């Protein structure tokens, strides 16, 4: 019945965003993604503790899907034999059938394929969300993602000036639920069902144990910090599909904002922290001014230092003594 | 003084909200409404967990009133003699003495008369207060409602466009602390007072045991689904007195949102999750575009699915294919 | 290198703001600033629980700092040789370095100055952050203040016109966290060294024994109680640099709000409750209509009333009873 050309997407892992057009002279397409739910036990912090994830194409968060207003988005969502639960998946911006959860439960060993058309624009998340209290434990085990719905025009500041992003990068952060033993170890389990009864009990205590960006404590630093260059507009995308974040750029700014996460609002200006509710993506992007290193951040402190919940910006340029300067290097006390 | 027109409301117990004219050619009135106190052991769960409720007219929330910009609002609070402890009422809608508070403290077997004039408009919490650490505690007993003052001329986008909404309901939700024994069981006390001491105890240390919409886990499902049909603008109305609760309808949007609640403000447009502060009332318009069940939660999905948080709607109408599409059912995957 | 008019303030402490203009004819000057950091053990609540603090001017939070769009902040940090710890400071503010951190970690017996421009207009967060694990401890040991960038041309609505406060008052929100032993009292520990092992234990399940305002419960009380007259306008900064917090002047309203603090954005209209989110401050204006006995208070009322956290106001003036009114005093029930 839909006429319309089709186009083939290859999703990247997050950090990264696979190639796009911001503003586009296209009109609306069908848009190929394919998703593959692997179940797998996974490290998650420096000491060794061990995680049973569950994951859209192997990755926590799940992949970032770019496309634009109008479009129709077209998953062909699979979970092969291999993995031991069903799983379907439902998108904050499609409308009907709970996302298109009640129309994607598959079994191990099944496929199915389902469209929406991008009628709101914005950053959104998706997840799994089986049934019950299968729901919290599929996304709390990671099975989260988020897609893009851009403008045809691009962005714009809400006061008619384009919005041009340099590069876009997506942190999904995860709140991680590991219980401990009498010892007061981190248990291991030997599949995600032999870790379900322990993990719901503190589950419905909502503490966790470990709140992570990319799906492991340090995961987006060292080889792996983001980069950028004085001069470049970054956009952040920042989804947490369960719990608050703070999101914060220590030595930087968030220039314009959807803290929301909705492009039909105007963006925010000048903002020190902002707030990812549960249950959504949010942007940001800044034009970066100083070159060093920058610590991207929820700005509970706690959870960024002692639970996972920082990144770095390793950033390149030259330094703005007009900006910041040490007027006087450390010295002793006169 | 006062020489207005005096008007009676009838409450009607929640969801539902008493009727009531969006735009309006009266002038000032002064609305006159009664809340009597009830404590009682009510029913919270599906396993017959007990809790020592202390309401607004028997319900958790309290009733939903509803009245226009200028309005004077005129409530007999009634504290009958059937009654165990002191009770007051503090509109956040409200200006001077607490909000009420200081003027409307009594004992079992009296009653008190408060007016205050609606001077702001938007939703708001009321709740009782009693004084020190009374005032958590008659609160997360139950003791919270909602008021809305709407503009004379109905609501509108910020954009010089009306907002009519075809039904409007109220969700109250109530983080409630019931402690447990020993065992693991969750304990039953014979009076509030007897239920204080544990239940302070609980409550200081900030994670619920129950998160419930309309007083009870499932309250609002079933027969008692929320309804609606393709092309109604159902607004929704949230309040949490003491909690924050970030609201979410699956499978929909929120079309305009005045997440602070507050209509002198402009609503965000196309939202999947808005953010209801503790203490605090917001309102959410949706028009419903498919048929079938959606799930309105806080997406603390946890809170949602394990917690209590979930109400349904049902929805009549056609299914619209290009909105969304199953184009392969579940299948083996080639 | 740079020549401007230099410009010494003499820091007061909190709640009250050292004296400054709104709108200004005064061009970009170099205005200097010194915080001594001082560690020391202070009492924190009404039963005597202790509590190894650590500060900027002694003070918690550390005092608020007044400057405009475009000028440079000169700020001499100094850590004596009476302390144990090394100390920096980050300010949310300027751009660069961590914030400043990376250009200000002191040793005992050293000080150190750094200069930054202005400019990005708002309040802002300042902290300590020495890295790593010993970030979350410092702040919230206490050591975390705000400063405002305000326009030179003063604060306005948005909307073209003009608001200026009357006063000012800032309230920093502290979240501490103080162990039990096994029977059930708070600990007290001889340095700030052998508190970290059981405070950071606590710290990492996330829930504050004590949630107050300037640093004790019952602090803004009393003698100390905020103060002011029917007809005038206070603007309350508030800040709170790990945790959020929900901000409600109970008995009136935030009639002009920045709840993301920052001027760039128009403030939100006729709020009941606002809030701040962990890692940042926030700013509302309210001009009385009512005299007596307001609480300020953050709106999760377990942390109000039973943590710490409330402030009172003392308010001068006439009753106005067209806003509220006692119709009926407390009688026996018909
Ligand atoms: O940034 C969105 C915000 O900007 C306004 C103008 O104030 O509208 C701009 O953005 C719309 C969505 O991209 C465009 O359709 C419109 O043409 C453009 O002016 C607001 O209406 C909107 O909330
Ligand atoms: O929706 C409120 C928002 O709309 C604006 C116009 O952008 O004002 C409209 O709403 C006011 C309150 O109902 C009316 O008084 C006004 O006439 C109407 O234009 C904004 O000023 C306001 O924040
Ligand atoms: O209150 C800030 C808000 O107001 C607008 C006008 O709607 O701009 C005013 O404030 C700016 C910052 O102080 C001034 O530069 C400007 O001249 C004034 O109109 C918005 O643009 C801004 O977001
Ligand atoms: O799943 N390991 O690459
Ligand atoms: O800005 N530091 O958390
Ligand atoms: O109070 N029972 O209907
Ligand atoms: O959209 N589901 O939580
Ligand atoms: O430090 N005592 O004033
Ligand atoms: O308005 N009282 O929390
Ligand atoms: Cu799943
Ligand atoms: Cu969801
Ligand atoms: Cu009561
Ligand atoms: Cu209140
Ligand atoms: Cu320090
Ligand atoms: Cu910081």
Redesign the interface.
């Known amino acids: ?2 006429k319309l050309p089709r186009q083939k997407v290859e999703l990247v892992a997050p950090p990264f965003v696979h190639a796009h057009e911001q503003a586009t002279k296209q009109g609306p397409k069908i848009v190929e993604f394919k998703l593959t739910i692997e179940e797998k036990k996974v490290v998650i912090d420096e000491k060794g503790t061990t995680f049973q994830a569950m994951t859209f194409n192997g990755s926590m968060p799940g992949p970032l899907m770019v496309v634009h207003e109008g479009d129709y988005v ?1 998953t062909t969502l ?1 979970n ?2 291999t993995n031991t639960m069903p799983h379907n998946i ?1 998108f ?16 191990p ?9 991008a ?4 950053v ?2 998706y997840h799994c ?1 089986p049934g ?2 299968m ?2 434990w599929h ?2 085990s990671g099975m989260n993602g988020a897609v893009m719905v851009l403008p045809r025009d691009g962005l714009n500041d809400g006061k008619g000036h384009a919005l041009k992003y340099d590069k876009v990068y997506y942190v999904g952060e995860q709140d991680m639920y590991v219980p401990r033993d009498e010892k007061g170890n981190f248990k291991s389990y030997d599949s995600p069902g032999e870790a379900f009864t322990d993990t ?1 009990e503190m ?5 966790p144990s470990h709140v992570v960006f990319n799906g492991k404590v340090g995961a987006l630093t060292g080889k792996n910090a983001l980069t950028a260059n004085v001069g470049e507009n970054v956009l952040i995308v920042h989804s947490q ?4 974040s ?1 999101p ?1 750029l ?4 968030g220039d314009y904002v959807w ?4 492009f ?2 105007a963006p ?8 990812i ?5 949010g942007a940001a992007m800044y034009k970066f ?2 070159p ?4 991207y951040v929820t ?9 996972g919940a920082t990144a770095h910006f390793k950033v390149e340029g030259k ?15 006169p």
């Open positions: 019945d839909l077209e699979v092969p034999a439902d904050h911006s499609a409308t009907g059938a709970l996302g298109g959860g009640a129309l994607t439960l598959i079994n060993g099944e496929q199915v394929v389902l469209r929406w058309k009628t709101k624009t914005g959104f998340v969300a019950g209290p729901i919290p996304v709390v719901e589950m419905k205590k909502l503490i599909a369960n719990r608050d703070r914060h220590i030595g930087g700014h803290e929301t996460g909705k039909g609002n925010e200006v000048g903002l020190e922290t902002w707030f509710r549960g249950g959504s993506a001014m100083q060093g290193i920058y610590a700005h509970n402190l706690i959870e960024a230092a002692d639970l330094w703005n003594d007009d900006l910041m300067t040490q007027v006087k290097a450390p010295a002793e006390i």
